[PDB]
Amino acid sequence: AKTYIFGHKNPDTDAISSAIIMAEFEQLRGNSGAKAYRLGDVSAETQFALDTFNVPAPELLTDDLDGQDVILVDHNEFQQSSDTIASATIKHVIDHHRIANFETAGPLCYRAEPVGCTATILYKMFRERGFEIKPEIAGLMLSAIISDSLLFKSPTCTQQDVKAAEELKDIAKVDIQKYGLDMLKAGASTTDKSVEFLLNMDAKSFTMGDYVTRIAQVNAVDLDEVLNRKEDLEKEMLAVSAQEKYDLFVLVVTDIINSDSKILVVGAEKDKVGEAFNVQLEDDMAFLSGVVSRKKQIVPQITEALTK
Amino acid sequence: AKTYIFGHKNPDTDAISSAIIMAEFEQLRGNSGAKAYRLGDVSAETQFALDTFNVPAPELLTDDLDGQDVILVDHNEFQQSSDTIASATIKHVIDHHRIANFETAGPLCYRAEPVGCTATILYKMFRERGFEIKPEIAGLMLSAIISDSLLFKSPTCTQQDVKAAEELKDIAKVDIQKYGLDMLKAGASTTDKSVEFLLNMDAKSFTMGDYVTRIAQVNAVDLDEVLNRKEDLEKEMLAVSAQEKYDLFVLVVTDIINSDSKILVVGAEKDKVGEAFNVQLEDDMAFLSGVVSRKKQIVPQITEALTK
Ligand SMILES: [Mn+2]
Ligand SMILES: [Mn+2]
Ligand SMILES: [Mn+2]
Ligand SMILES: [Mn+2]
């Protein structure tokens, strides 16, 4: 029996790391057929982490999952998952996100916790079972936590994430702030990249009531680096929205040095979500928010605007 | 800060017990606004357990859950939950079932394990946390486990359910086989009850792909006690299917002594699910299975038939 372990499409550092980490967990637990996979490209940020701790990228999933045992990490929504996910047998989910568009035939292990990072939950699982946390594995856990939490500044970050990171740094042999900022910087180069690349780099679809929304995330050293390409961005966001039948396309731009975030929003349901945010720039194509609240989570806020 | 804790509509013993057990857990955890509720009638089986351990029945939920904190036990599918569940904020789910028709705006705690009973999971939460298990609480846990497992003979039963029961017996101060058989017998009187009563006693709706299916469970001393009323059963099942627009209505009849089960199946997708079982008799309106495979679970097998 093989078991396929993977994170979401357009994987982020958490998605790649958690797949490798959970494959380790399964193997230490005695499940030798467990194997990590990815559903997309390894980003520059994630490559920095993999290179630092000398871990190879997981294999790109090309197998049909029909009748196969599957473990999902860092996602549950089927449209974020493998093309053949609906034909798989999902044994286990480990995740830190909202639940939607998820259905199984029978019972399964499902573990979600409202923490800042999937690797934090996996850290706790290793702990609970008393399994070895190798230095590389600790490095990937720490990388994931720094990535998802943005060096502990995102509204999703919790003290469990901070505590896990503090306990992992000596195992990984790494200074959190120094390594962390280097890692974040390694995925923050935008000006020489195409609009198509930026909008697909870290981008996921969401099932929100009757609607399907696309959300892309871009890190930069300066918000304006990205945001004065607004016109070209909007154009591509509208084109993709039509081609994929999205009801909404949100671009979240985040300053890694500053921790400030803004959103650029396009699509059929644009005006409805605009009411939920501080609109600073608007037109027929799009709206641009002022710098977003540090404490409120964006995904739930958008969901509530579309459903409520 | 209220938090409503409840099980599914037409609650079984697991659904009633687990709500009370989880309310205790929350109070014990420090959450003082936590309260147990029920969404329907207390069955004869459940009443026997409540009387044995002097636990009153939880309050019938009548409040609108709009904007309220909720914890679900022993279910997740929205059609099985409160009428206002979509307007609530689901903080926590503890369950042992398939997942479907479940969506949240934001992150949450979700704990599902593929075990025989929700109370088994709640028991593990007490053990993990080092919480004291009162003898009344231990009795409810044990009752739920005996109920869902049918005195440890159902396909869903695991060694974790057995282990937990062995340790709970001395806390509850009860003989498992003796109390268990009494409890099961108390909910197994069928010939005196109307067809309408039997089909609404332990009946839940399910989201299975494009379909909505209704499944009713009936415990009996002897399978033929119920199944000799075949035609009266079918008639009410078709009537309800038409009136509620179900694609399928399954009646599972289980012998409490030997744990043999048979299914009586009616509705639009009847032929499609008949494919997945050993059909002992059939006509235009219904099929009746032979004694169902002792290892494989019924709900997943139905779901699989309606999809693949
Ligand atoms: Mn991710
Ligand atoms: Mn993540
Ligand atoms: Mn139940
Ligand atoms: Mn149950």
Could you tell me how far CA B18 lies from the centroid of its own chain?
11
Chain A residues near residue B299 by CB distance under 8 angstroms: 106
Between CA B216 and CA B225, with CA B219 as vertex, the angle to 5 degrees is 105
Q: Which ligand is nearest to the CA of B8?
A: 3
For residue A87, the chain B residue with the least C-alpha distance is B308
Please give the DSSP secondary-structure letter assigned to residue A86.
G
Half-sphere exposure of A149 toward its Cβ, with a 13 Å CA cutoff? 29
Report the Cα–Cα distance between both ends of chain A, in Å, rounded: 44
User: DSSP for B108-147?
Assistant: -EEEE-SSS-HHHHHHHHHHHHT----HHHHHHHHHHHHH
Please name which of A215, A189, A174 lies closest in space to residue A9, comparing C-alpha atoms: A215
Query: What is the b/e burial string over B128-140, where b = at least 16 CB atoms within 10 angstroms of the residue's CB?
Result: eeeeebeebbbbb
Contacts 24+ apart (CB under 8 A), B56-65: B57/B16, B58/B6, B58/B16, B58/B19, B58/B20, B59/B35, B61/B4, B61/B6, B61/B37, B63/B4, B65/B4
B110·A110 Cβ contact <8 A: yes
Q: Write down the architecture of domain A189-308 according to CATH.
A: Roll (3.10)
User: C-alpha dihedral over B123, B128, B134, B139, to 10 degrees?
Assistant: 10
Chain B residues near residue A109 by CB distance under 8 angstroms: 112-114
Measure in Å the smallest separation between the Cα of B56 and chain A Cα atoms. Answer: 31
Distance between CA atoms of residues A287 and A264, nearest Å: 6
Strand partners, A216: A203, A251
In terms of DSSP bridges, do strands A211-220 and A248-255 run parallel, antiparallel, or are they unpaired?
A: parallel
In sequence order, what are the residues at sequence separation of 6 or more whose Cβ sits closer than 8 angstroms to the Cβ of residue B271?
Answer: none
B111·A107 Cβ contact <8 A: no
User: For chain A, how many residues are written?
Assistant: 308
Between CA A115 and CA A119, with CA A118 as vertex, the angle to 5 degrees is 110
Distance between CA atoms of residues B83 and B172, nearest Å: 35
Residue among A101, A103, A110 whose CB faces B112 most closely? A110
Q: Which ligand is nearest to the CA of B9?
A: 3
In sequence order, what are the residues at sequence separation of 6 or more whose Cβ sits closer than 8 angstroms to the Cβ of residue B115?
Answer: B96, B121, B156, B158, B160, B161
Same fold? B1-188, B189-308: no
User: For chain B, how many residues are written?
Assistant: 308
User: How far, in Å, from the CA of B22 to the mean position of ligand 4?
Assistant: 13
User: DSSP for A158-176?
Assistant: -HHHHHHHHHHHHHHT--H
The residue type found at B64 is D
In terms of DSSP bridges, do strands A3-6 and A34-38 run parallel, antiparallel, or are they unpaired?
A: parallel
Which two structure tokens, joined as six digits, stand for B299? 């709900």
In terms of DSSP bridges, do strands A69-73 and A89-95 run parallel, antiparallel, or are they unpaired?
A: parallel
Please give the DSSP secondary-structure letter assigned to residue B49.
H
Between CA A301 and CA A264, with CA A236 as vertex, the angle to 5 degrees is 30
Could you tell me how far CA A99 lies from the centroid of its own chain?
14
In terms of DSSP bridges, do strands B89-95 and B109-112 run parallel, antiparallel, or are they unpaired?
A: parallel
Residues of A with CB under 8 A from a CB of B: 87, 96-114, 156, 207, 209, 297, 299-300, 303-304, 307
Question: Tokens 């409490």 map to which residue?
Answer: B256
Distance between CA atoms of residues A244 and A211, nearest Å: 12
Residues of B with CB under 8 A from a CB of A: 96-114, 156, 207, 209, 297, 299-300, 303-304, 307-308
A299·B110 Cβ contact <8 A: no
Q: Could you state, in order of their start, the residue ranges of all structural domains in chain B? A: 1-188, 189-308
Please name which of A262, A266, A227, A239 lies closest in space to residue A250, comparing C-alpha atoms: A266
Classify domain A1-188 at the CATH superfamily level: inorganic pyrophosphatase (n-terminal core) (3.90.1640.10)
Instruction: Give the residue ranges of DSSP H helices in B194-284.
Output: 195-201, 223-227, 230-244, 270-274
Which two structure tokens, joined as six digits, stand for A130? 């008393």
User: How far, in Å, from the CA of B40 to the mean position of ligand 3?
Assistant: 12
Contacts 24+ apart (CB under 8 A), B184-187: B184/B45, B184/B146, B184/B147, B184/B150, B184/B151, B184/B219, B184/B256, B185/B221, B185/B256, B186/B44, B186/B45, B186/B47, B186/B48, B187/B43, B187/B44, B187/B45, B187/B46, B187/B48, B187/B219
Distance between CA atoms of residues A15 and A76, nearest Å: 12
**Model resolution, angstroms:** 2.1
Distance between CA atoms of residues A205 and A213, nearest Å: 6
User: C-alpha dihedral over B8, B13, B14, B20, to 10 degrees?
Assistant: 90
